[PDB]
Design a protein around this ligand. Structure first.
Ligand SMILES: O=C(O)CCCCCNC(=O)Cc1cc([N+](=O)O)c(O)c([N+](=O)O)c1
Length: 236
């Protein structure tokens, strides 16, 4: 059974500078295992995502050393050893399940005591389209070798969590769609302009959301770098 695969995280945690924080990530299918190749990502205001950990335990370059990831017993764990005020954020884990990624629901971390990037993924800020129509979203990679990375697409509906849409390999053309989005999204890419595209079809008000692109590749820190997100509003 994996058609109901659900990833669970703590609702909220509170810390302060110099404390240790433990965040966990559990799978409904059994123990979290090495094959789940877990990523941890951080959401700051407004819709600003950064990948912290990939491949269960690999810290992304540039991420502070106080962040570490591991598989401990049957869960994935992100530890912040010596929290800082800038760590106040929502933390999501993501698990690989055979042919799709599943995000956990996120943990809101509060830190008491409050008070350019080489790689860039470039998305337009906003789009509006009518119900029943389709729309094109774009994501241009800058400052890295675009064909050497897959492009993931992810959405966040208002007030809610992350949902994986699919990914495309620019080098081979291979596409994966999540079952949730295989009739909603269509992925294409253009290598000479380093641009990934996603067409969203048969729009409805449920499709009003922020849509992100993010990098990945086999064995890489999936979701290391993210576009800023395009806000789509579906309205007459
Ligand atoms: O221990 C070590 O480093 C050696 C083992 C490295 C395992 C790396 N796994 C992934 O990168 C996860 C993943 C695999 C895929 N696959 O295998 O087809 C995908 O297609 C896919 N995706 O996003 O679509 C994602």
């Amino acid at each position: 059974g994996s058609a109901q695969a659900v990833v669970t995280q703590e609702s909220a945690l509170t810390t302060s500078p110099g404390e240790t924080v433990t965040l966990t990530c559990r799978s409904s299918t059994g123990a979290v295992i090495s094959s789940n190749f877990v990523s941890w990502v951080q959401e700051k205001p407004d819709h600003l995502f950064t990948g912290l950990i990939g491949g269960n335990k690999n810290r992304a370059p540039g991420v502070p050393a106080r962040f570490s990831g591991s598989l401990i017993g049957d869960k994935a764990v992100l530890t912040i050893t010596g929290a800082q005020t800038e760590d106040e954020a929502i933390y999501f884990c993501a698990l690989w399940y055979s042919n799709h990624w599943v995000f956990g629901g996120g943990t809101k971390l509060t830190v008491l005591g409050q008070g350019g990037s080489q790689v860039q993924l470039q998305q337009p800020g906003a789009e509006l389209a009518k119900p029943g129509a389709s729309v094109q979203l774009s994501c241009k990679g800058s400052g890295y070798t675009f064909p050497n990375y897959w492009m993931h697409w992810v959405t966040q509906r208002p007030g809610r969590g992350l949902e994986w849409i699919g990914r495309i390999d620019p080098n081979s053309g291979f596409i994966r769609y999540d079952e949730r989005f295989k009739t909603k999204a269509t992925l294409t890419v253009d290598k000479p302009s380093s641009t990934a595209y996603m067409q969203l079809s048969s729009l409805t008000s449920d499709d009003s959301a922020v849509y992100f692109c993010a990098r990945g590749c086999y064995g890489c820190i999936h979701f290391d770098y993210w576009g800023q997100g395009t806000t789509l509003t579906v309205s007459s």
